[PDB]
Amino acid sequence: SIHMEDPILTGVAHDRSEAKVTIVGLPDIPGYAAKVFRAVADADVNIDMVLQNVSKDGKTDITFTCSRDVGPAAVEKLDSLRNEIGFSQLLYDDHIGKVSLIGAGMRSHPGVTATFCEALAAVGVNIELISTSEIRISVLCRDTELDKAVVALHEAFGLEATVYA
């Protein structure tokens, strides 16, 4: 029923079934993200997280996650289009764990982002990728570390919905 000034934290979700594909060296000009995502959609591949940060104007990288089971079809589809897309490498990592703090009103609580990263750091978990929104802080880590990341996060946030002050 909670589904207010402080964030609402509802759980720690954990996913062992994804792979990360990174398109490296994409021209940073209009229509290149489109080529990548249409190609992946054309091959009927379902993507989860997508991230594209700051560029080297110039060239940049695009990472997305998808199911391990379709990871190779996505990479093959993309490479079949290397000329049109113009990338220099594709990176593939099928040994990722995805761990998220799930919630609502999680925005402008950097203090919450910090607490998340401190708890993983306290148990030696390296954060490979971060994406946030209103409803989730998600990070990738080695799938081996996923268990302790989940326990760390439970402890750090006291986790039934929680209003976290």
Provide, rounded to whole angstroms, the least separation between the CB of residue 106 and a copy of itself. Answer: 10
Contacts with a copy of itself by CB under 8 A lie at 20, 22, 24, 28-34, 37-38, 40-41, 45-55, 61-63, 91, 107-111, 113-114, 117-118, 120-121, 124-136, 138
Measured from the CB of residue 108, what is the shortest distance to a copy of itself in angstroms?
A: 3
Report the length, in residues, of the chain: 165
Q: Is 113 annotated as a binding residue?
A: yes
Answer yes or no: is 46 a known binding residue. yes
What is the distance between the alpha carbons of residues 44 and 13, in angstroms, rounded to a whole number? 25
- Report what 26 binds from ligand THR, a copy of itself, none; CB cut-off 5-8 Å by kind: ligand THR
Q: Is 85 annotated for ligand binding? A: no
Contacts of 90-94 with C-beta under 8 Å, sequence gap 24+, read: 90/21, 90/22, 90/23, 90/24, 91/20, 91/21, 91/22, 91/24, 92/19, 92/20, 92/21, 92/22, 93/19, 93/20, 94/19, 94/20, 94/68
CB atoms within 10 A of CB 92: 14
**CA–CA dist 20, 41 (Å, integer):** 16
* DSSP conformation class of 105: S
Q: Is 150 in the site for ligand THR (CB under 6 A)?
A: no
Closest CB 150 distance from ligand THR, rounded Å: 16
Q: Is 31 in the site for ligand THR (CB under 6 A)?
A: yes
Mark the binding-site residues for substrate, compressed into ranges: 28, 46-48, 52, 112-113, 126-127, 133-134
List contacts with ligand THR (CB under 6 A). Answer: 26, 28-34, 52, 60, 117, 121, 126-127
